Amino acid sequence: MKFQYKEDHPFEYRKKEGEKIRKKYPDRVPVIVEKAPKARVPDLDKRKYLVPSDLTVGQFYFLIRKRIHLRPEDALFFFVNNTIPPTSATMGQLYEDNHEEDYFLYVAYSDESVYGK
Amino acid sequence: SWILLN
């Protein structure tokens, strides 16, 4: 799972930005959101999102879905570490469980249930 | 710059 954010910036740059933003907004988690490769979905212009920690993963799904102008009826899947997260988790829990050493949570989205298909 | 969701 490649992220343009990581290709664009070294680890030290990312971690400095991750710790800064985690201190500036403690009630929020920083999330990189990019389209998965070979995905048949609209692209997201912006990839850096600050998401409230008590937001459910499902509500976060809805927010990204509206940013790419899809309806609830459109096939849309989200991936963290190549697995689809549980809907009822909070974004804080997902962040605490999956954030990388640069303090970011990385999410990819696709129209297929398997990342990269 | 960052986008603040909800």
Numbering used by the authors:
A (entry chain A): 1 to 117
B (entry chain C): 566 to 571
Could you give the paper's own sentences about this structure?
We next examined how LIR2 mediates high-affinity interaction with the GABARAP subfamily proteins by co-crystallizing LIR2 in complex with GABARAPL1 and determining the crystal structure of this complex at 1.91 Å resolution. There are two copies of LIR2–GABARAPL1 present in the asymmetric unit and their overall structures are essentially identical to one another. The critical aromatic residue W567hEPG5 is inserted into hydrophobic pocket 1 (HP1) of GABARAPL1, whereas the hydrophobic residue L570hEPG5 is inserted into hydrophobic pocket 2 (HP2). Within HP1, side chains of the residues P30, L50, and F104 of GABARAPL1 form hydrophobic interaction with W567hEPG5. On the other hand, side chains of the residues lining HP2 (Y49, V51, F60, L63, and I64) are engaged in hydrophobic contacts with L570hEPG5. In addition, W567hEPG5 forms electrostatic interaction with the carboxyl group on E17GABARAPL1 side chain at HP1, and the main chain carbonyl oxygen and NH group of L570hEPG5 forms hydrogen bonds with the guanidinium group of R28GABARAPL1 and carbonyl oxygen of L50GABARAPL1 at HP2. I568hEPG5 side chain forms hydrophobic interaction with the aromatic side chain of Y49GABARAPL1, and NH group and carbonyl oxygen of I568hEPG5 forms hydrogen bonds with the main chains of K48GABARAPL1 and L50GABARAPL1. Upon LIR2 peptide binding, such interactions are disrupted, and the side chain of K46GABARAPL1 shifts outward by 8.0 Å.
EPG5 is a large-sized metazoan protein proposed to serve as a tethering factor to enforce autophagosome–lysosome/late endosome fusion specificity, and its deficiency causes a severe multisystem disorder known as Vici syndrome. We find that hEPG5 binds preferentially to members of the GABARAP subfamily of human ATG8 proteins critical to autophagosome–lysosome fusion. The hEPG5–GABARAPs interaction, which is mediated by tandem LIR motifs that exhibit differential affinities, is required for hEPG5 recruitment to mitochondria during PINK1/Parkin-dependent mitophagy. Systematic gene deletion studies of the six homologs of human ATG8 (LC3A, LC3B, LC3C, GABARAP, GABARAPL1, and GABARAPL2) revealed that the three members of the GABARAP subfamily play critical roles to autophagosome–lysosome fusion.
